[PDB]
Design an enzyme around this catalytic site. Structure first.
Site, PDB file in Angstrom:
ATOM      1  CG  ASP A   1      -1.812   1.053   1.821  1.00  0.00           C
ATOM      2  OD1 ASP A   1      -2.726   1.170  -0.172  1.00  0.00           O
ATOM      3  OD2 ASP A   1      -2.237   1.601   2.201  1.00  0.00           O
TER       4      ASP A   1
ATOM      5  CE  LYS B   1      -4.162   5.663   7.678  1.00  0.00           C
ATOM      6  NZ  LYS B   1      -3.848   4.483   8.333  1.00  0.00           N
TER       7      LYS B   1
ATOM      8  CG  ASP C   1      -3.170   3.395  -2.116  1.00  0.00           C
ATOM      9  OD1 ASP C   1      -1.956   3.866  -2.491  1.00  0.00           O
ATOM     10  OD2 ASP C   1      -2.859   3.923  -1.187  1.00  0.00           O
TER      11      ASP C   1
END
Lengths: 990, 202, 200
Positions: free
Chosen positions: A703, A772, A911
């Site tokens: 990732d 985040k 991703d």
DNA sequence: ATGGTGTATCGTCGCCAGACGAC
RNA sequence: GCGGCGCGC
DNA sequence: GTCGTCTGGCGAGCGCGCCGTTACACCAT
């Protein structure tokens, strides 16, 4: 005109259902009347002409030609194609075929115009060609045998003939795959599948079996009554048409009566207890009728057998024991061999659709009756309807809904049916999916399919993807085919534990919901006289909260039950997940309930059906993946991750052997279920005789930190910015989330040096987790409103003081991300501002922003105001995230296409790249190579040239076009960062 | 006792036994409908008004006054005016705009229809509960009142009388409600018959 | 264009120029008050009543009609009628009963006072914003409106121009009021003076 | 075992699409 | 279609 | 009437799924 559309739909449905004399009589009646001959177009005439043509009937076709001649219109190529097709069916004299070919050659029409411009079936084309070969036996069509090949810069080496070919193959033989195809065909011929539920079964007592018996006899009586009502309605509608009036008789005769009454009974079974709106039910019934007609036409047309033969020929490429003369891509193999392709469906007009739905709903309401009293006493023989019309309140409007009888609801509740229902398109395929060959042909068997999921628009998205040259979509389509050819299977060891926790008092902290029996009860009951003024008022406040919590728990258990029922259905089977894409280019699986774009439980229940030996480095990558899922070491290098994996091996073995009995080290991670799956895989691999010969089925994930900032740093070639997003090699990975958190924390301390209370409250309560999601979605187009909502959601799960309206945390996140832009990410700010200004100036000139990906996929933004004007707010605030999404989708598709050539099993979460544990290094090298190759092209310069050519081309509004040109030709200057260093970075994808 | 729950303004029973005409009004979020009777169960008039500028977001009372005045201008004179009464309460916060619209229309109809209230002190506008009407006509399934289109169709195609010259247009009007269902048009007639059965002629 | 953002109906300025008498009405939760003024800014009348049984937990149009008819019986005829237009919002899920009370009050007062509207469609009743009243007199802090008992003490106990005949009654009313928020009903007089200042 | 009735939280902001002045 | 939630990036 | 400047209301990143649309409270043959 509405009436013209209704008549055209009537005639088309007549030629679909072989009710040709009925349509002929209605056409004659309409043609006879002078006031009804108007609003009749040539489409109706040549539709009836083609219907006569398909089955003999020269005399009737000649009479239709006579009607067309009398109407004053001019026949076209389709009418002459129909005339030539009838003549072929029954052989006719040469003079007549010619006395017609010369007439078609006259008046400007071409001899080969019908073969290309007019779209006809293969049988019709063959019949016409046989009719022309009687006069001219030397007539022939160009073969055009070699297919076109994409020749773009980025996709050149994918389609190159030279090189090493190592395409992977499945692990199943040909006969097993053919049986799987037959099973999928039998499942999908029915429009609905029944699955045994996971809820704990209750032993059927006397009253339960009595309720089931009375349900059975009621359903039999309802089926008979519905059949009689359908027959009476069909007779009435036929008598209406015989009086020269439009009705819904051909539409009602689309399916067999058994299918229609089964569909009505199924939609009666699924009708909610509280009720549903009448218009929604009508639309659902009409859509289901259309879909069932599309599916069941292919049985009698003969396409099922041809599809079976071509599928059996095509699966020699994917079979383990079969070979092909030359290996090639699945889409190229399907394009050869003369395989059929699905044709675009013509949708019905909205008025006839709504009228058919309302007719079916009225049939259901009138035809169904039940005894008034459920008790055994049958006094007075009272029979009452089951469904009633209730004029109720929905939203802030008044809506007429359909409501069941409460006795029927009680009877359904008493007889607990242990069977859930699913649609055939909502379940994973039981055979390998079809190769993607067009936007309208692919994925599911015998079913309409759409390449793009965009409900909004859907007429401009499907126009740009069908105007562009066919090669430009190829790299997308193959990437959608490759993601579809991934064989999946269900990990039963995890499923046993999940169902053990589900069929009991559930564990909500591990992600499995709890049954409603453990809902939070009220602390106490009310009283007649309130002891305090605060009393008798907080009871509602602390009881409506409990009711809302119970409702949320019920919804969570419902979705978990559906997911686990579908997972238990496919326990001993191999299944495939077909993929679609949105307008930006992001890819999604077609089955919604059970896929890898889901929670921890959904991802842990999925494994690769095909496995590969671990090899020299598979076990190390498995242990690094397990440490990554554990989450304890995210700021540490890979060697320290491996050492940590060595240290905690005892806990891994204990969790694998005793998941729910001994120590529970797998609990306490971000993804406990995937951690347990990896623990079991590692325990099996270590205890094997040869750890490199162990065959693993567990996907390993790699990732990127922030794939939006990772692209922004590389379009601007920003030097110090690329360091934070791991585009520059380093021994220690760089976390952008922790740096933003540290900056916000130190500036919060600076603000708390002055006098403020919110800053002092937030001392020690801000971490990486609370910021985040916000930092990740800033580049995706979040505002301060959504950021505040996310921070409030994250702070409502801590021991924070009740000051949860934190409008300061989002302000600091945006402000110090912008300060980080000012220090090191200046290219990001410049490019984002330039893109937003360009989008705003395009929107102000009444246009929607269109561009093309470097892979050749055209993208258009569908946001418009309620022909219509663009919504400037949504048009200019979404262009940079949509551009970044197109870029990362292009990177993912390139990585998939270049990993397929090396025999890798590649599947993509956005991703996040998943592959076998033995193929991690190869995938990493391919990913870095394709990232450097994607950004070695002038993306911003090409975008500016396209926007100066597409927009800013008309000289009518010179004043706005001038400023548009100066803003569009103001590309920010790149930095001094070297892109090739990305090839030597170890934490770019990790 | 029953008339107390059926009728709220509580008009004394002698005035309810000497009526010669009645106008029943049912309004919704999109349209209004009214019907006229003359003590012989003879429908003198039966109308609906659909085009409105109300319930579009702006609760301006000026357009409320203009629309209500335009509706009342077509209404003939009668002994009493019965208005529908929904069961909505202030507890349901989600349906508050509907309650506000209904209350504004009810207040303006009470004020404007009672032309000579101040001089005599007698009420001429009545509120009738629709649940009682549904119970009277057996249109109640559970706690929800069901539609009465089929019962009105049974009437039109002893209980109620239609003038001979006025039948066919009414039937055509009924045939204009097949595609889209207008519940207020049937509810007005049902409430008028319920008034002539439960309070008058009892 | 300023009056269009202060007065809700689209009334003409030529009619507002040729005015002779205004009634200003303010109603609240518990009581109502009104004031009668002439073109010379003379206080002909100022009366408050608190005999309401409107809001006792039940909402009924009959009792509202009875009470409003009794109140409007004791009001002299005037050229124009104005009342408060507090801008509460539907979006807020609180203060719904007082908003419903305000809308029912405005509805029946609009119909009951606009006599001869059927014959000629002329609006004789208007609404003006509370913010205009709180900004023209500049007695309102940001996002609120403070009380004005000091301002009416400044007028009594030239703009108000109290009459000589009824000055003792007004003085007795001011002196005998120490509770029940009488200034929250004297906002009627404040709004009427603001209307004279702004509309002329 | 049931039906009988009952009614007083928001806290941002910027920006662009309809609304009114000049012609 | 609205509201309340949940998950993924 | 028409179209140019101004201000006041609108809406909040996408993709997917579930549920619901209508308080529960006091009482007694």
């Amino acid at each position: 005109s509405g009436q013209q559309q209704r008549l055209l739909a009537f005639f088309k449905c007549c030629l679909l259902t072989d009710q040709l004399p009925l349509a002929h009589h209605l056409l004659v009646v309409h043609h006879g009347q002078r006031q009804k001959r108007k609003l009749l177009t040539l489409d109706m005439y040549n539709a009836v002409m083609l219907g006569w043509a398909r089955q003999g009937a020269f005399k009737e076709l000649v009479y239709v030609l006579f009607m067309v001649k009398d109407a004053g219109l001019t026949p076209d190529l389709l009418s002459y194609a129909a005339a030539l097709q009838c003549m072929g069916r029954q052989d006719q004299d040469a003079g007549t075929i010619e006395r017609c070919l010369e007439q078609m050659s006259q008046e400007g029409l071409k001899l080969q115009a019908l073969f290309t411009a007019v779209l006809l079936s293969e049988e019709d084309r063959a019949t016409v060609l046989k009719a022309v070969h009687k006069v001219k036996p030397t007539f022939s069509l160009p073969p055009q045998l070699p297919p076109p090949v994409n020749t773009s810069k980025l996709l050149r080496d994918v389609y190159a003939k030279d090189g090493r070919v190592s395409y992977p193959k499945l692990h199943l033989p040909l006969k097993t795959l053919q049986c799987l195809f037959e099973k999928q065909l039998h499942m999908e011929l029915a429009s609905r599948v029944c699955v045994v539920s996971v809820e704990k079964p209750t032993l059927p007592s006397k009253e339960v079996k009595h309720a089931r018996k009375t349900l059975k006899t009621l359903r039999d009586q309802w089926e008979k009554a519905l059949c009689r009502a359908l027959r009476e309605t069909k007779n009435r509608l036929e008598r209406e048409v015989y009086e020269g009036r439009f009705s819904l008789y051909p539409f009602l005769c689309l399916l067999d009566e058994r299918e229609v009454v089964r569909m009505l009974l199924q939609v009666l079974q699924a009708l909610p207890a509280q009720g549903e709106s009448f218009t929604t039910l009508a639309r659902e019934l009409s859509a289901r009728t259309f879909s069932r007609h599309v599916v069941q036409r292919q049985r009698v047309s003969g396409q099922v057998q041809a599809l079976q033969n071509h599928y059996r020929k095509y699966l020699c490429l994917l079979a383990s024991d079969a070979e092909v003369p030359e290996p090639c891509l699945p889409r190229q193999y399907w394009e050869a061999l003369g395989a059929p392709e699905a044709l675009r469906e013509q949708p019905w007009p909205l008025p006839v659709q709504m009228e058919l739905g309302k007719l079916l709903a009225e049939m259901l309401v009138q035809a169904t009756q039940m005894p008034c009293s459920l008790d055994k006493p049958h006094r007075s023989s009272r029979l009452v309807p089951v469904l009633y019309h209730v004029y109720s309140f929905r939203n802030v409007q008044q809506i007429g809904i359909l409501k069941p009888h409460p006795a029927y609801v009680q009877l359904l509740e008493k007889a607990a049916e242990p069977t859930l229902t699913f649609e055939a398109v909502d379940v994973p395929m039981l055979c390998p999916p079809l190769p993607w060959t067009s936007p309208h042909s692919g994925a599911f068997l015998l079913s309409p399919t759409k390449l793009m999921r965009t409900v909004e628009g859907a007429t401009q998205h499907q126009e740009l993807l069908e105007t562009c040259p066919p090669t430009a979509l190829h790299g997308a389509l193959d990437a959608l085919t490759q993601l579809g050819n991934c064989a999946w299977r269900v990990n039963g060891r995890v499923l046993d534990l999940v169902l053990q926790l589900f069929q009991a008092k559930g564990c909500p902290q591990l992600g499995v919901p709890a049954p409603p029996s453990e809902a939070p009860q009220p602390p106490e009951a009310h009283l007649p006289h309130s002891a305090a003024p605060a009393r008798k008022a907080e009871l509602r406040r602390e009881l409506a909260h409990c009711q809302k919590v119970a409702r949320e728990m019920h919804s969570l258990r419902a979705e978990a039950l559906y997911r686990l029922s579908l997972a238990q259905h496919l326990r001993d089977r191999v299944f495939w997940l077909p993929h679609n894409m949105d307008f930006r280019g992001r890819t999604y699986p077609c089955p919604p309930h059970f896929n890898h774009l889901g929670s921890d439980v959904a991802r842990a229940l999925l494994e690769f059906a095909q496995g590969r030996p671990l090899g020299p480095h598979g076990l190390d990558w498995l242990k690094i993946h397990l440490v990554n899922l554990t989450g304890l070491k995210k700021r540490e290098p890979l060697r320290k991750r491996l050492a940590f994996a060595e240290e905690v091996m005892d806990d891994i073995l204990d969790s694998a052997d005793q998941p729910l009995t001994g120590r529970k080290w797998w609990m306490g991670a971000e993804e406990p279920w995937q951690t347990l799956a990896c623990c079991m895989e590692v325990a099996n691999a270590v205890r094997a005789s040869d750890p490199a010969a162990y065959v693993s089925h567990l996907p390993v994930h790699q990732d990127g930190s922030c794939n939006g900032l990772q692209h922004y740093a590389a379009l601007g070639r920003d030097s110090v910015g690329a360091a934070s997003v791991n585009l520059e090699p380093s021994d220690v990975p760089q976390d952008v989330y922790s740096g933003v958190a540290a900056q916000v924390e130190v500036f919060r301390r600076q603000d708390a040096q002055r006098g403020m209370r919110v800053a002092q409250v937030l001392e020690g309560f801000i971490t990486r987790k609370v910021v985040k999601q916000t930092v990740m979605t800033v580049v995706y187009g979040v505002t301060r409103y959504g950021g505040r909502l996310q921070i409030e959601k994250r702070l409502r799960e801590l021991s924070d003081f009740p000051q949860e309206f934190v409008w300061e945390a989002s302000h600091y996140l945006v402000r110090q991300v912008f300060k980080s832009l000012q220090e090191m990410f200046s290219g990001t700010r410049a490019i984002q501002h330039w893109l937003t200004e360009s989008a705003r100036l395009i929107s102000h000139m009444g246009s929607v922003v269109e561009w093309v990906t470097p892979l050749g996929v055209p993208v258009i933004q569908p946001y418009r105001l309620d022909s219509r004007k663009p919504n400037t707010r949504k048009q200019k605030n979404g262009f940079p995230p949509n551009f970044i999404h197109s870029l990362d989708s292009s990177h993912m598709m390139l990585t998939a296409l270049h990993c397929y050539r090396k025999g890798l099993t590649f599947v993509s979460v956005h991703d996040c790249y998943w592959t076998h544990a033995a193929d991690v290094s190869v995938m990493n090298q391919v990913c870095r190579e394709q990232f450097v190759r994607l950004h070695s092209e002038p993306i911003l310069q090409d975008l500016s040239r396209f926007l100066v050519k597409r927009f800013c081309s008309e000289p009518q509004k010179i004043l706005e076009a001038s400023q548009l040109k100066e803003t569009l030709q103001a590309v920010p200057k790149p930095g001094a960062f070297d892109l090739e260093q990305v090839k030597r970075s170890t934490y770019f994808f990790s | 006792r029953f008339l107390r729950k059926l009728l709220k303004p509580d008009i004394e029973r002698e005035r309810l036994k000497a009526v010669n005409s009645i106008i029943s009004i049912v309004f919704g979020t999109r349209r209004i409908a009214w019907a006229h009777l003359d003590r012989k169960l003879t429908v003198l008039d039966w109308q609906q008004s659909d085009r409105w500028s109300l319930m579009r977001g702006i609760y301006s009372s000026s357009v409320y006054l203009e629309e209500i005045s335009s509706i009342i201008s077509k209404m003939p004179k009668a002994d009493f005016y019965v208005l529908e009464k929904t069961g909505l309460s202030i507890q349901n916060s989600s349906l508050f705009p509907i309650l506000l619209h209904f209350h504004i229309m009810e207040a303006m109809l009470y004020a404007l229809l009672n032309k000579t209230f101040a001089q005599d002190g007698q009420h001429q506008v009545l509120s009738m509960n629709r649940n009682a009407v549904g119970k009277h006509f057996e249109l109640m399934i559970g706690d929800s009142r069901t539609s009465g289109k089929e019962l009105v169709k049974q009437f039109l195609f002893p209980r109620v009388f239609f003038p001979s010259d006025k039948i066919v247009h009414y039937r055509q009007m009924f045939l204009s409600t097949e595609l889209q269902r207008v519940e207020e048009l049937y509810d007005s007639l049902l409430q008028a018959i319920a008034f002539y059965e439960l309070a008058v002629f009892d």
